[PDB]
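Q: Hi! New to this. If I give you a protein sequence and the SMILES for magnesium ion, can you show me the bound structure?
A: Yes, paste them in.
Q: Okay, here:
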Amino acid sequence: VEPVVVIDGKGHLVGRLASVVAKQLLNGQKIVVVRAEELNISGEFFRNKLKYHDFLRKATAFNKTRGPFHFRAPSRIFYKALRGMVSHKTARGKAALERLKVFEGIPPPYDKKKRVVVPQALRVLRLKPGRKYTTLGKLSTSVGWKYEDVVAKLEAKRKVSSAEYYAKKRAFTKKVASANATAAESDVAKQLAALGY
Amino acid sequence: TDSIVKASNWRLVEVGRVVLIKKGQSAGKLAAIVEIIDQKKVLIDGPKAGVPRQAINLGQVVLTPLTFALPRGARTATVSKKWAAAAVCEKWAASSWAKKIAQRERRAALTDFERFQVMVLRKQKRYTVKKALAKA
Amino acid sequence: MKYIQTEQQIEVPEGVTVSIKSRIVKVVGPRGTLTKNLKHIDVTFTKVNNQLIKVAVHNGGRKHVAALRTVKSLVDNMITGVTKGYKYKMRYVYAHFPINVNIVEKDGAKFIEVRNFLGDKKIRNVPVRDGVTIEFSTNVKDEIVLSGNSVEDVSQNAADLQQICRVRNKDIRKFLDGIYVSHKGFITEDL
Amino acid sequence: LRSLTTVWAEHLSDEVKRRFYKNWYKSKKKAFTKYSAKYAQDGAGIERELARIKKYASVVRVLVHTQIRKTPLAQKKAHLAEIQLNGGSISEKVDWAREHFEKTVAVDSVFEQNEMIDAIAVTKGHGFEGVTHRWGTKKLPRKTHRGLRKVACIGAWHPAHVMWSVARAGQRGYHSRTSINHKIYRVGKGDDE
Amino acid sequence: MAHFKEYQVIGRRLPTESVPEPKLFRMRIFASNEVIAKSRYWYFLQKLHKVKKASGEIVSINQINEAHPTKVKNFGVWVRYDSRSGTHNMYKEIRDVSRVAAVETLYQDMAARHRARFRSIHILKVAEIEKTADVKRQYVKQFLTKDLKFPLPHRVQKSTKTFSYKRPSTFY
RNA sequence: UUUGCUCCACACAAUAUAGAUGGAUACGAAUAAGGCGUCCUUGUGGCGUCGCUGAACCAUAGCAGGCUAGCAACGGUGCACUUGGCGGAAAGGCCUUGGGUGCUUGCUGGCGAAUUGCAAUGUCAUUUUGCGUGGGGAUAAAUCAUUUGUAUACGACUUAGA
RNA sequence: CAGUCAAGCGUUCAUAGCGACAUUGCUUUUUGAUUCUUCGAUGUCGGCUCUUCCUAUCAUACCGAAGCAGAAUUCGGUAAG
RNA sequence: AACUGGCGAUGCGGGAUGAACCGAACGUAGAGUUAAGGUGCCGGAAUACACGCUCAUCAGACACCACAAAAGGUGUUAGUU
RNA sequence: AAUUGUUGAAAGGGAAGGGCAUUUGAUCAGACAGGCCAGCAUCAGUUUUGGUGGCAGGAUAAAUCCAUAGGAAUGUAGCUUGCCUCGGUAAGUAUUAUAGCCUGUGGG
Ligand SMILES: [Mg+2]
Ligand SMILES: [Mg+2]
Ligand SMILES: [Mg+2]
Ligand SMILES: [Mg+2]
Ligand SMILES: [Mg+2]
Ligand SMILES: [Mg+2]
Ligand SMILES: [Mg+2]
Ligand SMILES: [Mg+2]
Ligand SMILES: [Mg+2]
Ligand SMILES: [Mg+2]
Ligand SMILES: [Mg+2]
Ligand SMILES: [Mg+2]
Ligand SMILES: [Mg+2]
Ligand SMILES: [Mg+2]
Ligand SMILES: [Mg+2]
Ligand SMILES: [Mg+2]
Ligand SMILES: [Mg+2]
Ligand SMILES: [Mg+2]
Ligand SMILES: [Mg+2]
Ligand SMILES: [Mg+2]
Ligand SMILES: [Mg+2]
Ligand SMILES: [Mg+2]
Ligand SMILES: [Mg+2]
Ligand SMILES: [Mg+2]
Ligand SMILES: [Mg+2]
Ligand SMILES: [Mg+2]
Ligand SMILES: [Mg+2]
Ligand SMILES: [Mg+2]
Ligand SMILES: [Mg+2]
Ligand SMILES: [Mg+2]
Ligand SMILES: [Mg+2]
Ligand SMILES: [Mg+2]
Ligand SMILES: [Mg+2]
Ligand SMILES: [Mg+2]
Ligand SMILES: [Mg+2]
Ligand SMILES: [Mg+2]
Ligand SMILES: [Mg+2]
Ligand SMILES: [Mg+2]
Ligand SMILES: [Mg+2]
Ligand SMILES: [Mg+2]
Ligand SMILES: [Mg+2]
Ligand SMILES: [Mg+2]
Ligand SMILES: [Mg+2]
Ligand SMILES: [Mg+2]
Ligand SMILES: [Mg+2]
Ligand SMILES: [Mg+2]
Ligand SMILES: [Mg+2]
Ligand SMILES: [Mg+2]
Ligand SMILES: [Mg+2]
Ligand SMILES: [Mg+2]
Ligand SMILES: [Mg+2]
Ligand SMILES: [Mg+2]
Ligand SMILES: [Mg+2]
Ligand SMILES: [Mg+2]
Ligand SMILES: [Mg+2]
Ligand SMILES: [Mg+2]
Ligand SMILES: [Mg+2]
Ligand SMILES: [Mg+2]
Ligand SMILES: [Mg+2]
Ligand SMILES: [Mg+2]
Ligand SMILES: [Mg+2]
Ligand SMILES: [Mg+2]
Ligand SMILES: [Mg+2]
Ligand SMILES: [Mg+2]
Ligand SMILES: [Mg+2]
Ligand SMILES: [Mg+2]
Ligand SMILES: [Mg+2]
Ligand SMILES: [Mg+2]
Ligand SMILES: [Mg+2]
Ligand SMILES: [Mg+2]
Ligand SMILES: [Mg+2]
Ligand SMILES: [Mg+2]
Ligand SMILES: [Mg+2]
Ligand SMILES: [Mg+2]
Ligand SMILES: [Mg+2]
Ligand SMILES: [Mg+2]
Ligand SMILES: [Mg+2]
Ligand SMILES: [Mg+2]
Ligand SMILES: [Mg+2]
Ligand SMILES: [Mg+2]
Ligand SMILES: [Mg+2]
Ligand SMILES: [Mg+2]
Ligand SMILES: [Mg+2]
Ligand SMILES: [Mg+2]
Ligand SMILES: [Mg+2]
Ligand SMILES: [Mg+2]
Ligand SMILES: [Mg+2]
Ligand SMILES: [Mg+2]
Ligand SMILES: [Mg+2]
Ligand SMILES: [Mg+2]
Ligand SMILES: [Mg+2]
Ligand SMILES: [Mg+2]
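A: Thanks. Here is the predicted structure of the protein with magnesium ion bound:
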């Protein structure tokens, strides 16, 4: 549809986002995921802490470096849920992956672009009301992720500049729907009204 | 300082709650909830709209904030006599829902040439409004 | 079996206006003002008349309905805690060593200092919670009293002291030393 | 942490200059000669950078360098490195820094008597070293053949790779070490018979 | 086992010289098609009489259409089933609109709550409960209280494209 | 060492390309709740309204979009210039002043289009490099050898040398 | 090596600590049974060395229990840092 | 040991993997329909429909098959007297 | 021939090589002078996916609908009662009234 699709991770269940991101990727659709730290996982935080530790223990015996690499940042956890849904050792897989970017926070460009949502992975729509779940930021920070405060600092300042942005915006669209009302009942407008508009 | 508690004002599964079907041979038509079977099943009838008396998952319908007087379990004719009476149809026809439906039904009847007339039309509105949006 | 609806009543008094936007609660009356968050729970409140508020669970499981009542409680305590107040009393108990208790401050702090517990040359400290006021009872021996509006802030500042005085390495039935909550009540008398 | 600018003295000793080169004696020594021009004009382009730091920068470090000529060494090519600055206010830290360009700073404004300091240096190096001295492995018995300053069992049979935790002959020394908790027993002065 | 129809079935012990006009027994089988229905008929007759298909004959197989299919009813249901540790009778109450639509959810309930598949249930009796308050079971009695109403909270909308530009409501 | 390097300009050439072909169209937060408008005592506020999908919004007519006349407006948009200001998370992009200029399908005209023969993507993206032209700007170093020994099996390290 | 029932031991008191007759398991450093792999060859005890892992924890950390007064011990939990 | 079917001597599809299981037995190809088995993504194929059940601080997840038992639970579920 | 040097082209993120298929590069035969390819129309064989017409069964579908008789309550109107801000409640009567429903029989 679009050259690049920006996804506001906040509120999205890891595997169900990874699943749809994988498929957009492989069907040629470049995708960028933001605010990965606000990503969700089914089950309370302990189960998912325990889970990451189970991961954490696997390493090559004779040389812990060649073995599995464990990445702490909410985005790299997210890329990891993704990469295993992609035939990533093939030519085609490296292809599809390069179309994907994952970030903590909403960094430049993408803070001014519009970012979009995935209903089929939206927790508030998916999970049963009353289940317990996990925020990827808390889960990352508990296993070594360093930059949780810096990010929320940088974001708490982002969401300011954007409220202003939105503010001016909502103020202007008040004029536009104002002018749009002088134009109503005219000849033009009532005609369009007939044609559905 | 009185107390001041929210609301959360739901549409309710009740007798005489009008309900807009969504999928099936009746899909798109309105209907009333006669009697109420359980937490999911309901018995609807809509003799105004040509929808037959039936049981139907509330899944397949969407409740509408319209509601009229109906005896529980009222048979089809009595349904038709109250529906009328209550003046349901114009009440729903008046609404921002049901208009925004017609709205999109129309935009999809459009003739290629009709579409083209819509373009110039909007060119015409746009000129004069983009103007006004610069004078106050 | 999913009970379709159930509800609990929250009586409201004459000195108090509780206010619930989303599921944030703020009871406010004479003794101060208390606010507690219930977003974790999923009930529907409903003002009915400056003396009454209702809370509701639609189509709930046994576990869900259960937490209904206990939502009503937590808001009654917030009410009663802001009209009357909460008073928790604990008395020291020792066998040979007078447990000696004080209120020490380091950096605007307010702690509860406990020395010579069972002799221990170690000095025990429990920080005074905010919203709670500790008084050493006059006219009664080895009584300490914690007061305030947050039942849950008193009762904990209560048990923090008691449990800072657990007995290690000795038969804990012959060695009944410690400080124990002896009596929980309200701040306004008569009631 | 990312560095976003680096403002420099107007004048640079042939000491710190000597560090930026590998064949000084041949070089035309033109390093910083265009940077130093930034002062010629009123300042502006250095004020703006110094100003940047202040508006941004959660950390400020000072570039200092040793006066190696004031030392008996033969080695002229002075050492330079970054010292974080720990007094108040970001804007104050740069003001302090701005203020010191080309001016000097000595040990007493840093350390005092009886202070506990850590040393950071690169251990004396010893080249290639058998496992006996480099890890302290037991000497094998005299009767043993094809040598004895070894580990005898390099590994189990499985996993069937000598492993990263076995001790093995290699370089010893020239390692970076951060030692802590050395007391200063004296902060001596040069001007002081 | 499928979507159910009710069938009356009728058979009789193949006639003999000295016993022409044998006696005729009917059942009401709850099955999906007429071929299963007769199978069941013989399954159960050989549980009461000396017959088998080999020696009898079906006299009439007739579908029975629910009498008032837009009259909500409260159905009592009587069952015998085999568990992994023995066999036991039961009674449940199903609120629906035709004897057959109830037999459907019965076999579902029996399957979900008691892991019992078709092969292990026997439908002893299904009966329209006339007066209320003979409705014994609670999960039904809930729905018979006067002027009953109830919301449907946290409503969740079937998104028809992969991406969305809003951020949903669950409002209702 | 054969007049080399670099930023801006155009020209020819080559070589690409995980896949342009109207527009990635910016609050935040909640979801057993919110968006928007409006009123006030500015609140966990009164009142109104909406959702039930972007099926939207914006754009979109003109030789792939040629040549020209005019009217109504004083609005729109493209460009190159300039005014003031913002943005360091990867800012490298955003907002604003003022003239000059192109276009305007807001409306009314004059002229052209065929023969590409009934379809054959019927070519209009953006990569990187190379060669000459002249509009700005800039005049190093690293290595070998020699050398120290704070280093070293050898490479490597560390010094020193107009 | 660990359970279940609990008749009994434990002054009294089944289960603090134990536990008959029975019965249910687990483990694969016992030993058997088997003969699938290797007889144009997998060098075959013990120690030395040295690494790593398991836990059915001997010590060390913090605990619950006691037929724990104190000191000592014992049963048990989190535990192989 | 018995009967049959197989593997051996046999590829193809399913069972990730695999002599023997499921399906189906092979000349070279095209179009179609399927079996066994599947259809979040890897991966062709409904993040399909409908009723329930389950929340596990070592959940669970498809025959052969890659194991668990007695005994318990005021977790919750529906039933019986 | 194995194996080797040079030169030329090309590929190379823990081997190489192979199968089916196609891109691109290089190279080549034949065939025009009816050769290679296509596009539409009408048809043929196989096939897949839609719109639509006429009929047969059944309790000659079962319902709704209509008429009729009976009935009850998750009891509509009225009445009574009791508080209760001039009626609204609540608990009583009370089966159709100022709503309706159930059950049988009959009709199309
Ligand atoms: Mg692509
Ligand atoms: Mg590995
Ligand atoms: Mg992976
Ligand atoms: Mg790809
Ligand atoms: Mg949901
Ligand atoms: Mg609201
Ligand atoms: Mg349309
Ligand atoms: Mg103890
Ligand atoms: Mg002791
Ligand atoms: Mg810079
Ligand atoms: Mg040199
Ligand atoms: Mg010397
Ligand atoms: Mg050395
Ligand atoms: Mg040596
Ligand atoms: Mg050794
Ligand atoms: Mg020897
Ligand atoms: Mg090693
Ligand atoms: Mg059968
Ligand atoms: Mg039988
Ligand atoms: Mg049976
Ligand atoms: Mg769907
Ligand atoms: Mg490519
Ligand atoms: Mg924004
Ligand atoms: Mg706002
Ligand atoms: Mg609102
Ligand atoms: Mg507002
Ligand atoms: Mg005012
Ligand atoms: Mg306001
Ligand atoms: Mg408001
Ligand atoms: Mg829009
Ligand atoms: Mg034009
Ligand atoms: Mg024209
Ligand atoms: Mg004019
Ligand atoms: Mg103009
Ligand atoms: Mg930056
Ligand atoms: Mg970036
Ligand atoms: Mg920048
Ligand atoms: Mg202009
Ligand atoms: Mg135009
Ligand atoms: Mg072209
Ligand atoms: Mg030039
Ligand atoms: Mg010179
Ligand atoms: Mg035993
Ligand atoms: Mg016994
Ligand atoms: Mg005892
Ligand atoms: Mg006892
Ligand atoms: Mg005894
Ligand atoms: Mg016992
Ligand atoms: Mg075993
Ligand atoms: Mg074994
Ligand atoms: Mg052993
Ligand atoms: Mg053998
Ligand atoms: Mg052997
Ligand atoms: Mg061999
Ligand atoms: Mg050998
Ligand atoms: Mg061997
Ligand atoms: Mg060997
Ligand atoms: Mg040998
Ligand atoms: Mg005793
Ligand atoms: Mg003792
Ligand atoms: Mg002792
Ligand atoms: Mg314990
Ligand atoms: Mg260890
Ligand atoms: Mg370990
Ligand atoms: Mg066989
Ligand atoms: Mg055979
Ligand atoms: Mg053989
Ligand atoms: Mg064979
Ligand atoms: Mg075979
Ligand atoms: Mg296969
Ligand atoms: Mg199979
Ligand atoms: Mg995969
Ligand atoms: Mg697929
Ligand atoms: Mg586990
Ligand atoms: Mg366990
Ligand atoms: Mg384990
Ligand atoms: Mg799990
Ligand atoms: Mg089985
Ligand atoms: Mg398997
Ligand atoms: Mg047993
Ligand atoms: Mg059991
Ligand atoms: Mg149970
Ligand atoms: Mg039973
Ligand atoms: Mg490699
Ligand atoms: Mg010819
Ligand atoms: Mg030919
Ligand atoms: Mg052709
Ligand atoms: Mg044909
Ligand atoms: Mg037909
Ligand atoms: Mg008919
Ligand atoms: Mg009658
Ligand atoms: Mg009514």
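A: Chain D has four helices and six strands. Let me know if you'd like me to explain how to read the tokens.
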